[PDB]
């Protein structure tokens, strides 16, 4: 395994996952139009949140501690056993909450209580999301990029067929259930691949409870809770300010070019949890840690720069197929956004080192620094430049943040 070998395997699964999302996304827009798209915005966001919440947000800790204790079989069994009990226990509590609160949840997601049966069905679907993501986190701990990629690819195929059968049978609600089955059905190819590759015995998934390990995995639950609250709030108050001096359509072209970056950056960032996180978790000394970080920066910086320049050269083409061609001025924000993507990717290298060391001190400092930098630059550029300023503030944020990550790392290396 290497950074180059893991990136190629993850790129294949990312290419299929992106292409499958565009096929289901276009089929969603063609079948139900703008009325069904706006009515399903909150429900689709919950499905993305369930990819982390349904397993109590311990997946990054599972990969970290599996890679740390892969040598000792008894300790590795306790890691998988405690993780399995934590995922099964939390998802069961999530199913109970979703059933009892089926009417309020449907009211908060759709505005009415006509989707109670769907929410109760989601209570069982989220279990497949939690168990499927846990098995993928186990493969990431062993740096099994091929096994993780094959599971996502096969899962994307059955997820497209499941969405097709669901929407043709259940109509609009079937399509909603189909969107939930797409991440949940990964548990079937992932379970098959975990036993076909023979890296982990199936008996290790037996739920057990190691108290000391559960508390260690709870540190990553707080990390997932912080990252799902700190930065997304900054974007909410950013789009609020952007939509106060301008319209919400100006916000639409700002979030539109952001979805551009969210897709193509996965060709670089998705391999961080597959290789960089398990590798950095095993390294103990500062000399070996610095070697990996420098080697990773020498790889992801030119790779994300060649991809960003390619996206800029195809920004007119990318606006066409990926989004509705509504405002041709959407091409002028790519230059400022792709530059910020290059430095945000470089900042992800130092960020993933914080995950590998389970440092809550450096994690909060990283999220707070990104929050303060975004709000300071948005309060200065958004009211003057509009959506161009929202992309300009994002670029200037990670220009200074990456420089702050490099400066802090230099003081940490020399101690």
């Amino acid at each position: 395994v290497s950074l180059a070998k893991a990136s190629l395997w993850t790129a294949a699964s990312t290419l299929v996952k992106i292409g499958a999302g565009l096929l289901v996304g276009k089929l969603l827009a063609v079948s139900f139009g703008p009325a069904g798209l706006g009515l399903a915005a909150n429900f689709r966001q919950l499905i993305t949140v369930l990819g982390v919440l349904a397993g109590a947000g311990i997946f990054n800790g599972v990969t970290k501690y599996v890679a740390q204790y892969h040598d000792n079989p008894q300790q590795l069994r306790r890691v998988v056993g405690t993780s399995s009990a934590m995922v099964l226990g939390f998802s069961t509590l999530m199913a109970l909450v979703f059933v009892l609160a089926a009417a309020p949840i449907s009211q908060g997601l759709f505005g009415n209580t006509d989707y109670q049966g769907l929410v109760r069905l989601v209570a069982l679907v989220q279990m497949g999301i939690a168990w499927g993501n846990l098995l993928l986190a186990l493969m990431k701990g062993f740096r099994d990029a091929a096994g993780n990629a094959l599971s996502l690819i096969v899962g994307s195929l059955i997820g497209v067929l499941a969405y097709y059968v669901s929407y043709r049978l259940g109509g609009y609600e079937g399509a909603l259930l189909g969107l939930a089955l797409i991440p949940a059905l990964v548990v079937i190819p992932a379970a098959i691949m975990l036993i076909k590759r023979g890296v982990i015995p199936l008996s290790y998934l037996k739920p057990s409870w190691d108290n000391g390990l559960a508390g260690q995995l709870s540190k990553f639950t707080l990390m997932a809770l912080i990252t799902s609250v700190t930065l997304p709030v900054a974007y909410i108050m950013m789009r609020k300010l952007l939509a106060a001096q301008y319209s919400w359509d100006e916000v639409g072209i700002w979030q539109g070019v952001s979805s551009i970056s969210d897709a193509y950056l996965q060709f670089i960032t998705a391999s961080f949890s597959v290789y960089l996180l398990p590798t950095l978790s095993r390294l103990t000394e500062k000399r070996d840690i610095t070697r990996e970080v420098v080697k990773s920066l020498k790889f992801v910086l030119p790779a994300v720069a060649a991809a960003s320049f390619t996206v800029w050269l195809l920004r007119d083409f990318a606006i066409w197929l990926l989004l509705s061609n509504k405002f041709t001025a959407m091409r002028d924000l790519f230059a400022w956004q792709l530059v910020g993507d290059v430095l945000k990717v470089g900042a992800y290298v130092f960020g993933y080192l914080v995950i590998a060391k389970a440092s809550l001190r450096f994690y909060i400092l990283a999220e707070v620094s990104q929050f303060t930098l975004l709000m300071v630059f948005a309060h200065w550029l958004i009211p003057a430049h509009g959506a161009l300023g929202a992309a300009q503030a994002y670029m200037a944020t990670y220009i200074v943040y990456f420089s702050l990550c490099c400066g802090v790392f230099l003081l940490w290396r020399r101690r």
Epitope: Q245, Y246, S247, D249, E250, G252, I253, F327, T328, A329, M330, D332, H385, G386, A387, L388
Partner: nanobody, 124 residues
Framework: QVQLVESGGGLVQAGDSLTLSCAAS????????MGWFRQHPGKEREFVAS????????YYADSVKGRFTISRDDVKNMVYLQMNSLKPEDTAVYYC?????????????????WGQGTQVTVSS
């Protein structure tokens, strides 16, 4: 650098409609925010309607909103000012102005390029 010419405008009764067209002639004219101004003899040019350079949001004057509607076509590089419920007070010479990365200001000084202007007269 963008050239602006105005079309339409003329003698029209009070209560009907009459649309305008501002043809933008320049390189990458999509980067220019467009605005509509009208002027009466003696007084200075007053703001009517404008649009952001991205074309997402529009702006209108207090005695203009609800009646007038400004639109832009990026493919043909032309701005429009669809006028409805015309009153004799609307009789003025209408100008279209452009500004690089602008279109949110109601002041005529915040616009770089201007047109020759078209005449609109409302009687009866």
């Amino acid at each position: 650098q963008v050239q602006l010419v105005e079309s339409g405008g003329g003698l029209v009764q009070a209560g009907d409609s009459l649309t305008l067209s501002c043809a933008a002639s320049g390189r990458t004219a999509y980067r220019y925010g467009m605005g509509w101004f009208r002027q009466h003899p003696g007084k200075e040019r007053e703001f009517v309607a404008s649009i952001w350079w991205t074309g997402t949001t529009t702006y209108y004057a207090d005695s203009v909103k609800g009646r007038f509607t400004i639109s832009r076509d990026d493919v043909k590089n032309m701005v429009y000012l669809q006028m409805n419920s015309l009153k004799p007070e609307d009789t003025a010479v209408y100008y279209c102005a452009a500004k690089f990365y602008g279109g949110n200001s109601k002041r005529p000084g915040d616009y770089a390029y201007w047109g020759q202007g078209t005449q609109v007269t409302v009687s009866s």
